[PDB]
RNA sequence: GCUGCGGGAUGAACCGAACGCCGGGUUAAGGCGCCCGAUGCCGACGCUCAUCAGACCCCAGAAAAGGUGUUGGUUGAUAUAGACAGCAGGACGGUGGCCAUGGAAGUCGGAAUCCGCUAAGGAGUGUGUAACAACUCACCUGCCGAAUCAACUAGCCCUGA
RNA sequence: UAGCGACGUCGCUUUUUGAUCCUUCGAUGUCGGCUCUUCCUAUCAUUGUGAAGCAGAAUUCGCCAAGCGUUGGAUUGUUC
């Protein structure tokens, strides 16, 4: 809130996003309408092991990875990005099986 | 601070066809035609677009009051375009205590005649506006629906009804009786 | 409506003041009420004049914003404002008003004799044509 | 007596703000008496319930 | 000051008289906006008497000169620091004006402080005049004039009361 | 007083200016819509609308206080890491945590109060079922597009009258 | 803060009384009542309204408002 404070306000999310920036290929673009019930733990618990799911404000994330990129690629997740409640489980695992488990595995399952 | 050229953007849909002869605006649509006179307002009116029908409302210089004025033309043109497509519909549930209220439409939808109104003997004959119809609606207890084109005329009629039903010399936190506007909407639904 | 609004580089006439009858070109607007004008060939030096002083007309140019006398003169000569100015009815009206002020008595004598001859020819041919219109509408 | 219709009638005649200086009925969100007879004060009070 | 006509900028330098207690006084310099050099010489003593131990019999005014405008054909943006004195108490003020010359800007300042806050030519002290660059003007009027491709017409322009005869059959077509 | 004259309509004392009788010219204090001589200036800049406007030393009626009426100004706080209100989503869990067993499963009352998940949830601002429950607020995220919010001050006008 | 409101504080009024002596001492007939006309509003009632600790009634407090009313008597010369 004074920018970074070295506390958990603003530039700790802009430490986590930009320090969990050098461990992955494949942001996955999970989005749910409401998570107010135990759906939060239904997001994390079933996908644990590799449990991530971290993205704050998409308004925060406009010029964020642009200005603190130094990663060239993966900025082609551009303006198709902002819109929609997106949670971003950026992963490092095998193929589409992640999305397959989520193709339903939190809200009715 | 003597600003410059504030401009409002009024989209026009495909069905309605607009035509202005000055500050007098004449709009045609499926549900009749309509017109107003914006003579006393002194604002540039102009339209642009071959069959896209964009309207811009533009006022130069001015004051802060006149920058407040330039949005009101936009909002009235919006309401006229909503009316000439759809038309406005006011749904009024009559709220009655131990006494009922009888409401009849006396002649041709225009005249509304209210009776028995807390046991008052005085028959209350209220004359509505030209260009608006009134009907006692079906499938609902004492709901009264006013339908018309010009929203000023229709809502002036609704105000005339609710100020015809007004309780004198009592508490008005008790004696909650009258005919009140419950819902504002369109003639054709889902639009 | 409002066909002619001011701009960077629109020519203008100066009606009342120390420069009556002289074209200027508008360089830029200072603040709402005066503006900097300049005339390269119409003999008027770069200065700030009010808007109610100046009279607007319809020719424009292409200036950079706040250019020099040089580029104003270049666009002036390349657009040929003076000849095209004299070839409009507005300047014909101004020219006629100046000639009417600069008449003399012998000129007014010739004007009245030509005026009588013209109005007599008009009167005869108008009376004949409206008599012929009556004779046309008579059947 | 229909409590939803009671909510409607109380919406039209009860939940208003009353100014202490001009005594005029205004609006539930309003801050200022619009009348000239007091002069646009910010001195209000809620309308009393039963 | 009466601020009559149009203002003029004077550069005025002056010093105390040399005493045996102090040879060569520091010879100060100010920038006075005045209708003429006499009002400039008096207003110079008025400021320097507030700032340092000086008065008109104590010292001398060495040079008093007109400051010709360094860039007259340019349209400049001026910031003025005002120390007007109201009925209740004195204040500070930062005003902005878009105008040609410094003298015209200070004239617009006096006229606008006469018009808005009813402050006469008594109470106004001009602290500092600074030609400020574009895009740092705080005020919204000068900010909205900061545009190229500026367009406006001249709406409802009416004029010439009785420049015609007082009686005519024309009724004027304003625009 | 002992003193006219030009202005302040009107006056002893005010502001100019003091007196023989006259012709020309110039001004002072004041004033220049018409009474009434002069702005019949293509005057310069802004402010204010009054349902009791305002209009010139002496002077022939007004204050304390208030105004999201407008116009400036000061000091802070937010806004590109997207505020501001508007539309849309939620508003948990260890945990029916704890005082109670009159309810209380955050909602009359009491002590308190940590942590996790996160986008954030206040061991929960309240709506309302006597209570269980939907529901909102605090807090959070999308569409949005450039200024916004909070105090304070003084000019005109309005209330006070 | 519906209605009041101390401690303080800013005004208005000339229907109380007081202060002053500016006008008249070669005279302005001095109290009260009877009658009679008009005006003000700082509204007691009536018309139209809003707010109440306004359920109804009866009240209280405000606003536009002076059009129209505001009496009969015992006492005292009385105003009161
Ligand atoms: Mg009652
Ligand atoms: Mg004597
Ligand atoms: Mg003497
Ligand atoms: Mg004398
Ligand atoms: Mg006299
Ligand atoms: Mg007078
Ligand atoms: Mg006299
Ligand atoms: Mg003489
Ligand atoms: Mg004079
Ligand atoms: Mg005259
Ligand atoms: Mg104010
Ligand atoms: Mg006043
Ligand atoms: Mg005496
Ligand atoms: Mg006496
Ligand atoms: Mg006598
Ligand atoms: Mg006598
Ligand atoms: Mg007598
Ligand atoms: Mg009367």
Swiss-Prot record, chain B:
GO terms for cellular component: cytoplasm; cytosol; cytosolic large ribosomal subunit; cytosolic ribosome; focal adhesion; membrane; nucleus; ribosome. InterPro entries: Ribosomal_uL6-like, Ribosomal_uL6-like_a/b-dom_sf, Ribosomal_uL6_a/b-dom, Ribosomal_uL6_CS2. Keywords: Acetylation, Cytoplasm, Ribonucleoprotein, Ribosomal protein. It is found in: Cytoplasm. The modification N6-acetyllysine is found at residue 121. GO terms for molecular function: RNA binding; rRNA binding; structural constituent of ribosome. GO terms for biological process: cytoplasmic translation; translation. Component of the large ribosomal subunit. The ribosome is a large ribonucleoprotein complex responsible for the synthesis of proteins in the cell. Component of the large ribosomal subunit. Belongs to the universal ribosomal protein uL6 family. This is Large ribosomal subunit protein uL6. The lineage of its organism: Eukaryota, Metazoa, Chordata, Craniata, Vertebrata.
From Swiss-Prot, chain C:
It is found in: Cytoplasm. There is a cross-link at residue 123 (Glycyl lysine isopeptide (Lys-Gly) (interchain with G-Cter in SUMO2)). The keyword Aminoacyl-tRNA synthetase does not apply. One of its GO terms (biological process) is cytoplasmic translation. GO terms for molecular function: cadherin binding; RNA binding; structural constituent of ribosome. Keywords: Acetylation, Cytoplasm, Isopeptide bond, Phosphoprotein, Repeat, Ribonucleoprotein, Ribosomal protein, Ubl conjugation. The modification N6-succinyllysine is found at residue 84. The modification Phosphoserine is found at residue 138. Its main location: cytoplasm. The modification N6-acetyllysine is found at residues 78, 84. GO terms for cellular component: cytoplasm; cytosol; cytosolic large ribosomal subunit; cytosolic ribosome; extracellular exosome; membrane; postsynaptic density. Belongs to the eukaryotic ribosomal protein eL14 family. Component of the large ribosomal subunit. Component of the large ribosomal subunit. The ribosome is a large ribonucleoprotein complex responsible for the synthesis of proteins in the cell. This is Large ribosomal subunit protein eL14. It comes from Homo sapiens (Human).
Swiss-Prot record, chain D:
It comes from the Eukaryota. It is found in: Cytoplasm. Trimethylation of Lys-21 ('Lys-22' of the mature chain) by SMYD5 promotes translation elongation and protein synthesis. The modification N6,N6,N6-trimethyllysine is found at residue 21. Changing residue 21 to R/A: Abolished methylation by SMYD5, leading to decreased translation initiation and protein synthesis. Component of the 60S subunit of the ribosome. Ribosomal protein L40 is essential for translation of a subset of cellular transcripts, and especially for cap-dependent translation of vesicular stomatitis virus mRNAs. This is Large ribosomal subunit protein eL40.
Swiss-Prot record, chain E:
Its main location: cytoplasm. The keyword Phosphoprotein applies. One of its GO terms (biological process) is cytoplasmic translation. The modification N6-succinyllysine is found at residue 76. The modification Phosphotyrosine is found at residue 63. It is found in: Cytoplasm. It comes from the Eukaryota. One of its GO terms (cellular component) is cytoplasm. GO terms for molecular function: RNA binding; structural constituent of ribosome. Gene3D superfamilies: 3.10.20.10. The modification Phosphoserine is found at residues 71, 123. Coiled coil: none annotated. There is a cross-link at residues 11, 128, 170 (Glycyl lysine isopeptide (Lys-Gly) (interchain with G-Cter in SUMO2)). Keywords: Cytoplasm, Isopeptide bond, Phosphoprotein, Ribonucleoprotein, Ribosomal protein, Ubl conjugation. HAMAP family: Ribosomal_eL20 (MF_00273). Belongs to the eukaryotic ribosomal protein eL20 family. Component of the large ribosomal subunit. Binds IPO9 with high affinity. Component of the large ribosomal subunit. The ribosome is a large ribonucleoprotein complex responsible for the synthesis of proteins in the cell. This is Large ribosomal subunit protein eL20. The gene is RPL18A.
């Amino acid at each position: 809130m004074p920018r970074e404070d070295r506390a958990t306000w603003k530039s700790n999310y802009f430490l986590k996003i930009i320090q969990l920036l050098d461990d992955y290929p494949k942001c996955f673009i999970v989005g749910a309408d409401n998570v107010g019930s135990k759906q939060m733990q239904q997001i994390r618990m079933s996908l644990r092991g590799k449990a991530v799911v971290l993205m704050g404000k998409n308004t925060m994330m406009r010029k964020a990875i642009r200005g603190h990129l130094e990663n060239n690629p993966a900025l082609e997740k551009l303006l198709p990005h902002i819109r929609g409640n997106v949670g971003f489980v950026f992963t490092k695992e095998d193929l589409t099986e992640i999305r397959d488990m989520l193709l339903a595995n939190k809200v009715p399952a | 601070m003597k600003t410059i050229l504030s401009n409002q953007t009024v989209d026009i849909p495909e069905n309605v066809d607009i035509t202005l002869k000055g500050r007098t605006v004449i709009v045609k649509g499926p549900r009749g035609t309509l017109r107003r006179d914006f003579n006393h307002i002194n604002v540039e009116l102009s339209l642009l677009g071959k069959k896209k029908k964009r309207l811009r409302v533009d006022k130069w210089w001015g004051n802060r009051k006149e920058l407040a004025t330039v949005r009101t033309i936009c909002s009235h043109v919006q309401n006229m375009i909503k009316g000439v497509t759809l038309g406005f519909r006011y749904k009024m549930r009559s709220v009655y205590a131990h006494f009922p209220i009888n409401v009849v439409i006396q002649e041709n939808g225009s005249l509304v005649e209210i009776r028995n109104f807390l046991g008052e003997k005085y028959i209350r004959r209220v004359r509505m506006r030209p260009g608006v119809a009134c009907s006692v609606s079906q499938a609902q207890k004492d709901e009264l629906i006013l339908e018309g084109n010009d929203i000023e005329l229709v809502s002036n009629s609704a105000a005339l009804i609710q100020q015809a039903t007004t309780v004198k010399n009592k508490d008005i936190r008790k004696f909650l009786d009258g005919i009140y506007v419950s819902e504002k909407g369109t003639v054709q639904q889902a639009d | 409506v409002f066909r002619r609004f001011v701009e960077v580089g629109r020519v203008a006439y100066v009606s009342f003041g120390p420069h009556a009858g002289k074209l200027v070109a508008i360089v830029d607007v200072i603040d709402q009420n005066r503006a900097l004008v300049d005339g390269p060939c119409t003999q008027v030096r770069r200065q700030a004049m009010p808007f109610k002083c100046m009279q607007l007309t319809d020719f424009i140019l292409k200036f950079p914003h706040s250019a020099h006398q040089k580029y104003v003169r270049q666009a002036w000569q390349k657009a040929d404002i003076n000849t095209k100015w004299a070839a409009t009815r507005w300047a014909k009206k101004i020219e006629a008003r100046e000639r009417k002020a600069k008449m003399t008595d012998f000129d007014r004598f010739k004007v009245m004799k030509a005026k009588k001859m013209r109005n007599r020819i008009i009167k005869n041919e108008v009376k004949k044509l409206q008599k012929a219109a009556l004779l046309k509408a008579s059947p | 007596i229909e409590p939803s219709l009671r909510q409607l009638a109380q919406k039209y005649n009860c939940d208003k703000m009353i100014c202490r200086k001009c005594y005029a009925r205004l609006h539930p969100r309003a801050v200022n008496c619009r009348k000239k007879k007091c002069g646009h004060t910010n001195n209000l009070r809620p309308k009393k319930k039963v | 000051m009466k601020a009559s006509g149009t203002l003029r900028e004077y550069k005025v330098v002056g010093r105390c008289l040399p005493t045996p207690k102090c040879h060569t006084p520091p010879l100060y310099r100010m920038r006075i906006f005045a209708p003429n050099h006499v009002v400039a010489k008096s207003r110079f003593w008025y400021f320097v008497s507030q700032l340092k131990k000086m008065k008109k019999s104590s010292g001398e005014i060495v040079y008093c000169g007109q400051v010709f405008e360094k860039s007259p054909l340019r349209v400049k943006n001026f910031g003025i620091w005002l120390r007007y004195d109201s009925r209740s108490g004195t204040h500070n003020m930062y005003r902005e004006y878009r105008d040609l010359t410094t003298a015209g800007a200070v004239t617009q300042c006096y006229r606008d402080m006469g018009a808005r806050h009813r402050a006469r030519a008594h109470s106004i002290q001009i602290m500092k005049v600074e030609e400020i660059a574009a895009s740092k003007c705080r005020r919204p009027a000068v900010k909205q004039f900061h545009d190229s491709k500026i367009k406006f017409p001249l709406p409802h322009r009416v004029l010439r009361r009785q420049h015609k005869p007082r009686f005519t059959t024309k009724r004027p077509n304003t625009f």
